[PDB]
């Protein structure tokens, strides 16, 4: 695949893009700018999604108090009312008081971002962040 | 302005931005990548703080010793592995969910090394 | 010889045994459960010893407040939790792998309360 | 789904059987006679298992040496070579010199038991042991 085209831009704009790759371990402003397309690539493509379209791919993130009892039910009733699929779901401790899961799931992206929302809104429920994945990136 | 730079790009994604720059209405790539850029830097210390972070990896299930040489990077890169999951997404990809700890340098460096490889499609970090 | 005592299965599984019966040859249920038991004795210190361990679960996914009471009892054991990963198997199953810690009486504490867990299918432990 | 029934045996035999249920934690032998049945029922259904029915479930725990070099994929190619399918694999590190690995497992008796006989084999496994379900435990 890999090919190779050339940007122009304002050097006003420019400084604050080479800072940036200096701090934050880039080797290159090709790198971060790739980086950067692909991400609002995959953000576009989610953002004009059909609903027929029940094939994104993206894992959420959560961080939650294990001791916040019935929590778990909560989470799994709104999953199983969002019309997503779960495809696994990962759990580890993070101490004693919280717990980190990854949810790997298929879905649309409204379905997706909205189980996104409801669990973000859980009380003990402390951090809920998706990664999203479009098909150019990988098919 | 005027300054010039290039990027590298798969083709299946410069199609990608060509396309989105037919139907959004821009009149050159170097345009709509700069709207890009100037997005990115209104939406985007690092430092020897321990964070548990999850990397989130699509890669080619066929491609000989890949998993091989992010074992290889992990080591690399300094973050302590936690926990991997991986499944199959489809028959050329598998998605792999990585739970690790360490602190911003790490951190960064495991997600930029694994992320070059070949094979490897897709790697996000989300730190907590 | 002559002792006689009460036995509990499930529909499904006493069917299961009932076609063996048939199959294999046997002339009572007494009579193949008594060379099972024989076998199985053929086959199968607890101490306070730190072991990691695996334990199955395959479980009824709509069964409410199931995840819950596994939490719990996982709390009860006195086991230490490393990991757990689900997966659905269909639409009325999922199957749970749980990576632990504990020493002998915890471990085998968890398998048996779990295991006793209305909508608990199969919980099967393996330890290193 | 529970009936209960009623089953006869040497007295001789229940010795074994009434010290098990002490030291193993049983409440009753009930209990250990029943669990003994299903494991039976499991390998007895897997011993006589079609090779079109690729739709069992197992499965494998895997202790390994992780810095033995190029073991991952040893293994990638042999389970790839056997005809089963990884739905679901974990892995994680018990100290410096292991992993242990969950893989969860669909296809016939045979072929997954055959990985597991070749993962064994290996240089570097130092465990392979396989949990076997059946349908009836689930179905
Ligand atoms: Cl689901
Ligand atoms: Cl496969
Ligand atoms: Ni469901
Ligand atoms: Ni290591
Ligand atoms: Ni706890
Ligand atoms: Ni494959």
């Avoid at 950067?36 to 993130?61: G, Y």
């Avoid at 990854?102 to 929302?117: A, H, K, M, W, Y």
Wanted: hydrophobic letters at 35%; one cysteine or more.
């Amino acid at each position: 695949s890999i090919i190779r085209f050339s940007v122009s831009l304002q050097q006003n704009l420019l400084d604050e893009l080479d800072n940036r790759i200096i701090k934050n371990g880039y080797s290159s402003r090709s790198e971060l700018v790739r980086d950067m397309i692909r991400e609002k690539l995959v953000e576009d493509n989610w953002a004009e999604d059909n609903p027929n379209d029940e094939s994104k791919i993206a894992v959420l993130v959560v961080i939650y108090d294990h001791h916040q009892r019935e929590l778990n039910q909560r989470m799994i009733d709104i999953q199983h009312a969002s019309g997503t699929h779960v495809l696994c779901t990962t759990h580890i401790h993070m101490d004693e008081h919280n717990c980190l899961e990854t949810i790997i799931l298929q879905g649309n992206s409204f379905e997706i971002q909205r189980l996104q929302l409801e669990i973000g809104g859980l009380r003990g429920v402390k951090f809920a962040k998706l990664t999203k994945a479009s098909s150019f990136e990988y098919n």
